[PDB]
């Protein structure tokens, strides 16, 4: 079963949450396969139960599975590394201090492992103290290029730039995308992305020269009555992707 995401035209793959197993199947079909379906470690009492249920999801969607911390929660980073070791998904969400352990325990470099780093309000400078203890200490704020080189040194695949707050951090995001393009590194914009800002946010990464972009799109496409990601919103997003990835 494949360990790399199904990028559309090798450039863009959606990342969205599933509300259930049936929703995961529908999302996977709506995206024509060009999606990673997020399942949260935080929903299981232990590693064994999470691994079991995630392999059930993986089987429905040809392994197009993204293992989630749950809202970037660093307290889930160890459990994510353990779950991902057994599940061998296509995608893993990590915080900056959990990238090395996750890569090492996966035992291969095909699974995409992202590394959560955060806007600071100043272009070119990012917060990287995003682990469970380090997130409680004075912030570690470093140059974007150096943060990327450190993620690469630790075996990471991509930056998760979070929380973006939609377009509120757009100049910082653009500088990160330009730095990713220059280093061969991939990019996952996350936080407040929706049907109105998604095209611009992806277009900025594309125009900067980012090789692979994995946007995450969550509450803005989720039906609150069922907790499901709406398949019609996934198609709307896939149409945008086909329009701008040529």
Interacting residue ranges for K ion, rule: CB under 5 A: 181, 208-209
The candidate with the shortest Cα–Cα distance to 126, out of 187, 67, 77, is 187
Q: What x-and-dash track marks residues 82-101 binding Br ion by CB under 5 A?
A: -----------x--------
Q: Which of 32, 178 has the CB closer to a second copy?
A: 178
Number of residues lying near a second copy (CB under 8 A): 19
Q: Is the CB of 181 or the CB of 217 nearer to K ion?
A: 181
Instruction: Establish if 206 lies at the interface with a second copy (CB under 8 A).
Output: yes
Breaks, C-N > 2.5 A, in the chain lie after none
Query: Angle CA(198)–CA(204)–CA(205) in degrees, nearest 5?
Result: 95
| Rounded least distance, CB 101 to K ion, Å | 32
Can you tell me which of 9, 52, 122, 243 binds a second copy, judged by CB under 8 A? Answer: 9
- Distance between CA 219 and CA 205 in Å, rounded? 22
Residue of 176, 208, 221, 238 interacting with a second copy (CB under 8 A): 208
Cα-Cα-Cα-Cα dihedral sign, residues 60, 211, 166, 190: positive
End-to-end CA distance of the chain: give it in Å, rounded: 27
- Told to check if 158 binds Br ion by CB under 5 A, we report no
3-class secondary-structure state, position 84: helix
- H-helix segments, the chain: 21-30, 47-60, 77-87, 99-106, 144-153, 170-183, 198-208, 231-244
Tell me whether residue 40 or residue 181 sits nearer to Br ion (CB atom). 40
Q: Considering only 5-13, 37-45, 48-56, 80-88, which stretch makes contact with a second copy by CB under 8 A? A: 5-13
Q: Mark 37-76 with x for binding to Br ion (rule: CB under 5 A) and - for no binding.
A: -------------------------------xx--x----
Residue 125 β-bridge partners: 143
**With respect to K ion, which residue has the nearer C-beta, 131 or 189?**
189
Rank residues 79 and 210 by Cβ distance to a second copy and give the closer one. Answer: 210
Contact 227, 18 (CB under 8 A): no
Q: Which of 210, 217, 238, 240 binds a second copy (CB under 8 A)?
A: 210
Q: Is the dihedral of CA 163, 165, 167, 172 positive or negative?
A: negative
Contact status, residue 132 vs residue 94, Cβ threshold 8 Å: no
> Which residues, numbered 97-156, are part of the site for a second copy (CB under 8 A)?
149, 152
Beta bridge partners of 160: 116, 188
Least Cβ distance, residue 18 to a second copy (angstroms): 29
Binding residues for a second copy, rule: CB under 8 A, are 9-11, 149, 152, 178, 180-184, 206-211, 245-246
């Amino acid at each position: 079963m494949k360990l790399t995401p199904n990028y559309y035209r090798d450039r863009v793959c959606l990342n969205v949450l599933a509300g259930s197993k049936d929703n995961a199947r529908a999302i996977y079909q709506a995206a024509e396969g060009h999606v990673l379906v997020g399942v949260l470690s935080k929903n299981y009492p232990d590693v064994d139960s999470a691994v079991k249920d995630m392999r059930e999801y993986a089987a429905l969607i040809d392994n197009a599975l993204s293992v989630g911390l749950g809202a970037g929660d660093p307290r889930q980073s160890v459990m994510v590394s353990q779950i991902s070791q057994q599940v061998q998904p296509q995608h893993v969400n990590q915080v900056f201090t959990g990238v090395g352990a996750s890569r090492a325990l996966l035992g291969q470099h095909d699974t995409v492992v992202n590394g959560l780093i955060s806007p600071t309000g100043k272009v070119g400078y990012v917060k990287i103290s995003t682990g469970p203890l380090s997130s409680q200490q004075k912030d570690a704020i470093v140059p974007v290029t150096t943060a990327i080189a450190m993620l690469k040194d630790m075996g990471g695949s991509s930056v998760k730039f979070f929380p973006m707050n939609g377009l509120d951090s757009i100049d910082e995001y653009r500088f990160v995308a330009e730095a990713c393009a220059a280093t061969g590194f991939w990019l996952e914009p996350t936080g407040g992305i929706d049907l109105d800002n998604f095209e611009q946010i992806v277009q900025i990464a594309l125009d900067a020269g980012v090789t692979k972009v994995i946007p995450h799109i969550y509450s803005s496409i989720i039906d609150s009555k069922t907790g499901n990601t709406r398949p019609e919103d996934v198609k709307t997003l896939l149409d945008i992707v086909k329009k701008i990835v040529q």
